[PDB]
């Protein structure tokens, strides 16, 4: 038996655990790619649902969506689906925040620029009738050219309550926390978990509300306990704060 993957690629390392993501070099074209390997479900209608997904997702092109290349099936001696995506930077949004722990390092322009890219990506999906469902700093990447991409789709800190215990409004909740986290640097993991757990419950640090009153009202709208009351992604983009950005 000849495996497409082993034939065409030289594996480099593992990138994601699970649904597994490898880094591999294509032999013909000499580029490195992120390759996700999914073990397909064994029942037919479960597979058919997954295959209908790759078909819808294949049509996706956007500056905030990671670039797609190829999708194929293998059945060695049960069945694996392989997905070839562009390889992003080693350091993700979580890595980025961790190396920048002072408010001087969290420039208001840079952070709103990063956030806007994520929001624009989510608006894109929502208009196609899709949703991400998996937004979080560790699953937000930069390209070799520092363009922000939302990560894999299709820790529960960034999950909306109705996700844990439901519509596209789940993505809106996730955005809320990311916006907060971007503007509010942390010193320790301990602090981070405590503060973020409190923010989910609308208990904001005073210094934040003092410094970013505009963004504060936005985060409140995005973190509404009633999903109905949360804004759409388009409303977030069409907000006053996203004007005159250099």
List interacting residues with ligand 3Z6 (CB under 6 A).
15-16, 21, 34, 36, 54, 57-58, 60, 65-66, 68, 71, 83, 85-88, 141, 151-154
Of the two residues 66 and 172, which places its CB atom closer to ligand 3Z6 in the complex?
Answer: 66
Least distance to ligand 3Z6, CB of residue 179, Å = 21
Least distance in Å: CB of 213 to ligand 3Z6?
Answer: 35
Least separation in angstroms between CB 236 and ligand 3Z6: 21
Residue pair 40/113 in contact (Cβ under 8 Å)? The answer is no
Which CB atom, from 124 or from 173, has the smaller least distance to ligand 3Z6?
A: 124
CB of 36 to ligand 3Z6, least distance (A): 4
How buried is residue 191: exposed, middle or buried, by Cβ count under 10 Å (0-12/13-18/19+)? exposed
Q: Which is nearer to ligand 3Z6, 9 or 184 (CB)?
A: 9
**Contact in structure between 184 and 212 (CB atoms under 8 Å):** no
For residue 58, CA distances in Å to 67, 82, 156 come to: 10, 13, 28
Considering the complex, state which of residue 118 and residue 199 has its C-beta at the smaller distance from ligand 3Z6: 118
User: CB-hemisphere CA count at 13 Å for 171?
Assistant: 24
**C-beta of 157: minimal distance to ligand 3Z6 in Å?**
18
Neighbours of 76 (CB within 10 A): 11
* Residue 73 or 207 with smaller CB distance to ligand 3Z6: 73
List of residues 6+ apart from 48 with CB closer than 8 A = none
Q: 180: how many CB neighbours lie within 10 A of its CB?
A: 23
User: Closer CB to ligand 3Z6, residue 40 or residue 54?
Assistant: 54
| Rounded least distance, CB 59 to ligand 3Z6, Å | 8
Rounded to whole angstroms, how far apart are CA atoms 195 and 186?
A: 9
If you write DSSP's letter for every residue of 30-90 in order, what string do you get? --EEEEEEEE--SSHHHHHHHHHHHHHHHT---TTBPPEEEEEEE-----EEEEEEE---S
- Whose Cβ is closer to ligand 3Z6: residue 152's or residue 215's? 152
Q: Are 181 and 97 in contact (CB under 8 A)?
A: yes
State the nearest-atom distance from the C-beta of 24 to ligand 3Z6, in Å. 12
């Amino acid at each position: 038996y000849i495996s497409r993957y082993l034939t065409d690629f030289e594996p480099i390392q593992c990138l994601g655990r699970g649904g597994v993501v490898f880094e591999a070099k294509n032999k013909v074209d000499d580029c490195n790619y992120a390759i996700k390997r999914i073990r397909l479900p064994n029942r037919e209608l479960a597979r058919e649902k997954v295959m209908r997904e790759v078909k819808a997702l294949a049509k996706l092109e956007h500056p905030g969506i990671v670039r797609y290349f190829n999708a194929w099936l293998e059945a060695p001696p049960k069945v694996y689906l392989y997905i070839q995506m562009q390889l992003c930077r080693k350091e993700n949004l979580k890595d980025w925040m961790n190396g920048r722990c002072t408010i001087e390092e969290r420039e208001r322009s840079v952070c709103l620029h990063i956030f806007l890219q994520i929001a624009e990506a989510v608006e894109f999906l929502h208009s196609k009738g899709l949703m991400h469902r998996n937004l979080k700093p560790s699953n937000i990447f930069f390209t070799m050219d520092d363009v922000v991409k939302v990560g894999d789709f299709g820790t529960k800190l960034y999950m909306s309550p109705e996700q844990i215990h439901y519509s596209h409004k789940v993505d809106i909740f996730s955005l809320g926390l990311i916006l907060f986290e971007l503007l509010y640097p942390f010193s320790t993991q301990m602090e981070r978990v405590r503060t973020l757990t409190d923010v989910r419950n609308l208990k904001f640090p005073p210094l934040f509300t003092q410094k970013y009153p505009c963004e504060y009202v936005m985060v409140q709208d995005m973190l509404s306990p009633s999903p109905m009351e949360r804004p759409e992604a388009i409303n977030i983009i069409e907000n006053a704060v996203f004007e005159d950005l250099d």
